[PDB]
Amino acid sequence: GRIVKMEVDYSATVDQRLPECAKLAKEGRLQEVIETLLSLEKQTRTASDMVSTSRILVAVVKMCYEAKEWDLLNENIMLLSKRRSQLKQAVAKMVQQCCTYVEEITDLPIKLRLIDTLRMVTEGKIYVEIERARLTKTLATIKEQNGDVKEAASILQELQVETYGSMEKKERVEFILEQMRLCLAVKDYIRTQIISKKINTKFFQEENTEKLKLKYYNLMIQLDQHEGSYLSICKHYRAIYDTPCIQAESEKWQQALKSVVLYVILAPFDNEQSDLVHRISGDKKLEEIPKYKDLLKLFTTMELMRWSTLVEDYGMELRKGSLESPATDVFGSTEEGEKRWKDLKNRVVEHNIRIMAKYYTRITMKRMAQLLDLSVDESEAFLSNLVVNKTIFAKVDRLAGIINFQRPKDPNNLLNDWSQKLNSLMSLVNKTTHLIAKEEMIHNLQ
């Protein structure tokens, strides 16, 4: 910062001094090497020598390493960090050398003295000089005890991005997401969502992202899967499905599609899914698997499905198949997979009920059960659930077992439709005549 006029270079004075202190320490004069150095630096500090202060500062740190003076290392680390503000970058170099010490030295006291370096920086005498050094340093504590309930707190306390801004973007995404995996271990799902939203602020950092982000963002395919999310998880697999364009492994790409099409169907009907299913369908890469026609069973012919036929024609998605990799996870489990079996039946029953609504005015209750493949009492239970949620219009007269899907026609709606019929009829007449002139009055003259 401040450029002092060049009068005397202080490097030479320490050059012949630091190695001399090494000899005294080697013999066993651990103290004599220590106290002498501090007086050496203090003179440099008044002169505020960046290079001179840094080189000497590490030496005392370096010397204590080989000296095996762990008790004297910690006490020496503190005394060198709060004497006269030191030189801001001077402490920066010191932590770096001390940083490599923890990563290499095993045995318990590393953690005991590990926290000592954490507090030396803490959040005072910090920033670009000793900012990022802290981030890794707390990460080591994270792996200190392999990850537990307590560790999740030990890492959440670090507010990434907002505070550790002046540090590498690629490494940032790793730290921000690594604590997310800690959240899942403890099974804290509310916190996982909020922490998750802080990384999606920026995307498209896949320049060298073989697994850095895209394949490491699998957690959201685990967090979101917990409660009820199907469409949300579906969009995620497609998101990694762009990786096959980047990672086009034969087996990997095949399993992803089976997953994408698997519980795209699982999600309930909604305008968001209607255009999503269309995009998934029609790709020139879906024909490689029989699953394509299963998904096609939700688009064409209106597919009045028979759950008996669906199971018998597609029992492979529960045991085995071409690769069946998603099938074992999606449906092959004991509890998590089994739930998705009931949910699929609900969607298959939901498709039958909705489609029959379009093409039916009144359907007897008994025949409704046969199409839906559930008992009459169960059919009423499902119908009531849909009607109460304002999804399907249906009024059931259970005294006669007849349920009609027709809204009581309003006087204006009955007449309004008649108005629209005339408009089309008038327009067609205009179009019909205008097509006659193109033909009758063109070729005739010739």
């Binding site: 009531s384 009024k395 005294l399």
Partner: protein, 53 residues
């Protein structure tokens, strides 16, 4: 004091639960209302009578 207000809340909730069961259909046997509501036929009949007025 909370125990003082339970009686009102039970009356209020019973109102909502009856609508949730009668909305899904039209003319329906009262017996099935009792089975779904889990209540006797006598009180359900009267409760409906007060509701309609």
């Amino acid at each position: 004091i909370i125990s003082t207000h339970l009686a009102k809340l039970y009356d209020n909730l019973l109102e909502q639960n009856l609508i949730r069961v009668i909305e899904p259909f039209s003319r329906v046997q009262i017996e099935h209302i009792s089975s779904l509501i889990k209540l006797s036929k006598a009180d359900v009949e009267r409760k409906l009578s007060q509701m309609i007025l």
